[PDB]
Amino acid sequence: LDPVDPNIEPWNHPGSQPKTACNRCHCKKCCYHCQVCFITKGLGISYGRKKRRQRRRPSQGGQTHQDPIPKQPSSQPRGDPTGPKE
DSSP: OOSSSSSSOOOOOOSSSTTSSSOOOSSSSSSSSOOSSOSSTTTTSSSOOOSGGGSOTTOOSSOOOSSSOTTOOOSTTTTSOOSSOO
């Protein structure tokens, strides 16, 4: 775990497939800060996250992030045409 930063850097979704196209729907919103496989396998449950583990807070151009942009989809309804987020 914790290779580059997260396991496969899965903080870049269209907001219409990995979280809408009949995907997982069981471990993505399992009340746990929504980590979705990141620096720790505990899923940010309570091992001691540092937030800076992302090393790309300013990167959110269609990133559909969860911790940095939990505000909304962002860069979707007003940025890149993902699908039904416009």
